[model samples]
Target: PKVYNSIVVDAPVERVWSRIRNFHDFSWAPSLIKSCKKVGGGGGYSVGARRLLNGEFLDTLIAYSEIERRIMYSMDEGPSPVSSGEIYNYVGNLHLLPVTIDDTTFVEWSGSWESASTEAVEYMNTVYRSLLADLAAEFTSESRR
Candidate 1:
């Protein structure tokens, strides 16, 4: 199964990328990710580090590329279909691209897993959409300041 979501932020790619590049920082998506706690070894920018989202979702950093403005992670544990054995090889990727015309940012969030559960697809799509909306709003509001 696969899930994809994207949003355009009214800010430069560097500005938006800097806000989300850190695995532990979900401050831009406050509506969905209420809290994030570092778990196990490594740090936010370190690959293989773990972090618990809302104390329920356990995700590990897979790769982070500053030059490319990309980050990848895999969820080891989560609710329902995303919990452990229910899902296999779940990997999520976030990429940022520069919108040269407006000097803004185009963000893409995508995820793919081995299982084909309609429920999981819907859940993940909704979550990613909401997160993108929140992220866009964060920069929108900040631009006004």
Candidate 2:
């Protein structure tokens, strides 16, 4: 299965990309994650680095490109109302593109996974939607400041 969504932030690409590229930053979604920390390989956005999210979901940085302003990762571990043993081959990405309208930015997040349960897919859709909206708000609200 696949899930994808995009949002336009009311802020410059540079402004938004700064925070988004910071692999350790998650304070923007305090409503969702309790906290995030690097697992090993020192810290930050390097390959082999992993982040434990909310002490439940664990993700590893499979790829990152500062020039492209894109990051790809895979789920190493997960648990929640949406994740269970039934999910696997979970991969995700966030790509940033500049929008002509405001010369700001458009962010796209996409994920694909293999699972037998349809219910989990629906729940994951809701979860990703919430996260993306909150992340856009983080940038949009900051643009107002």
Candidate 3:
């Protein structure tokens, strides 16, 4: 599957990063995500945490490269008939870049899923796009405040 979307917001990189780093604050993004609850693992936003997002519980691993200002993670879906015994390859990455334009930041979120059918891929694409749009609006509104 191939999908790409981005939003340029009028906000500093630090402000944008602050909102993205905190999972609990995802409620502010009602457009994209319904809810994100911490289930197990690390106390903070680090690697190796189990989170239940939107009713689906999965093992979440996060990695942040400070230099690049990028956060990457993979979600392991267990015992799903969609792909063999279980799906182990639903991955996502978020890239945040500082733009030269004053108080502006560029953000991109991309992900993929391991599915047995093309219909699943198309459905996910639509879902992701809606999610991203909600997130973008959340970031922009919060930063302005």
Candidate 4:
């Protein structure tokens, strides 16, 4: 399965990058997440660190690169907290690129995994789209403040 979404933020690359780079910070989009917290991340930035989303969906940090402005994470048991869901070997990545001409930037978020149910695709598509939309809204609102 594959899921993807992207958005252009009016903020500078540094602003957008800093917000997403803070692995433990969900301040960028709080309404959708409900609650997020780091559970077992070493140094909190390296691989092997874990985060629990909404106190249900568990994920681990697998890869990161500051120069490339990318972060990758994986699911623990399934793609989500749904009991009957059977998504496995999942990996989600987010990347940021500078629009140096305008001081704005573009963000591309994507995820993929093995699944037997077609429902997983639809569900993830909605989730990723909403997340990307909210990310853009977050910066737009902040810029107004």
Best by lDDT: 1
Query: In terms of TM-score, which candidate is strongest?
Result: 1
Residues 1-145, model 3: lDDT tens digits = 4345677877788877776775434664677466678877674366676666677635475776666877666666533332334444767777889987576788887766655555445555665577667666666645477
Candidate 1: tens digits of C-alpha lDDT, residues 1-145: 8988998899988888878888988788888998899998898799999899988999999999988989999998998868876888999999999999978899999999887565689889988999999988878836745
Error of 1 at 36 (Å): 0.3
Cand. 3 Cα-lDDT: 0.64
Query: Which lDDT tens digits does candidate 4 get at residues 1-145?
Result: 7888888888889888888886777677765687778887474567788888787778788998899999898877533432226767888898999988878889998988876765677777777787788888878836735
- The C-alpha stretches of model 2 lying farther than 4 A from their native spots are 80-84
lDDT per residue for candidate 2 within 12-74, as digits (tens), equals 888778877867777767667788987888456787788899888898888899999998988
TM-score of each: 0.94, 0.89, 0.76, 0.88
Give residue 91's lDDT in candidate 2 (0 to 100): 91
- Model 4 misplaced regions, further than 4 Å: 78-85, 141-145
Candidate 4 TM-score versus the reference: 0.88
Clashes of each: 0, 0, 1, 1
Task: Return the candidate ranking by TM-score, descending.
Answer: 1, 2, 4, 3
Which pairs of residues collide in model 2? none
Could you tell me which residue pairs clash in candidate 4?
Answer: 41-49
